[PDB]
Design a protein around this ligand. Sequence first.
Ligand code: D5I
Ligand code: D5I
Lengths: 122, 122
Amino acid sequence: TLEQVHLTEDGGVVKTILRKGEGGEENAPKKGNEVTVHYVGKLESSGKVFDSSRERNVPFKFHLGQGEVIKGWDICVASMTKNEKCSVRLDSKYGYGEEGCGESIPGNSVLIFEIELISFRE
Amino acid sequence: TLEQVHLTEDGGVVKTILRKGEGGEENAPKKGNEVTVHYVGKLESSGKVFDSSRERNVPFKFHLGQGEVIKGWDICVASMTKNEKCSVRLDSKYGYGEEGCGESIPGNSVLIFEIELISFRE
Ligand SMILES: O=C(NNC(=O)[C@]12C[C@H]3C[C@H](C[C@H](C3)C1)C2)c1ccncc1
Ligand SMILES: O=C(NNC(=O)[C@]12C[C@H]3C[C@H](C[C@H](C3)C1)C2)c1ccncc1
């Protein structure tokens, strides 16, 4: 019943909106903007959480579209609007690829992130 | 001739100040503060740069002391003051450990980061 939006043509970044954000230009973030989000990241296969800003109780901030984050994140957040909450499924291409990252992210891992866009600014 | 400051007792985080920052309480950042830095990260062995905010020409921001970054970074930046520029050598314990992170960071890699603390805020 919830729509799944394919943000790439290879099925590699698939976003499901769990809560719609606010409409209007003033509510969609722009390339380079500092975006403030909460996220929980888990492996698709095991469901094991590898990283969470919610566990930190500190909103995470990055500069949109500049490669400060994995590519699936730049693509997913570019599609979001203020207050939007989503679950995105990232193929390893859009994640940490063949080699993974640390113990908690094996090579060739599909990652599932719940991401809430809290605010942004220039 | 330049001092090397061992910020842990295991030799794992060794900081060399290349340019002294400004003194005074108002110029040392506090746990939880948003710190704005430029960095260039390279592998010690090969010297190959794996990541650089300077190449992005976008200052990188994180929340100090909250595990938003590798542990060597939390330790190193906690010791810095506004405008300080340093080179820190991180044993893999304080980096990406046994498994590394992606192609560009093999397991058991010593990382060398040049880090400039530009500003911070609460
Ligand atoms: O992990 C790297 N950048 N980080 C990222 O893309 C993220 C991945 C997780 C979800 C958000 C916040 C944290 C944890 C950092 C984005 C990285 C990749 C390769 N080499 C060094 C760092
Ligand atoms: O790499 C992760 N967090 N990122 C980090 O600690 C850094 C490492 C590099 C220097 C700064 C800016 C970028 C690149 C992210 C800090 C990470 C580790 C494990 N799992 C997911 C993300």
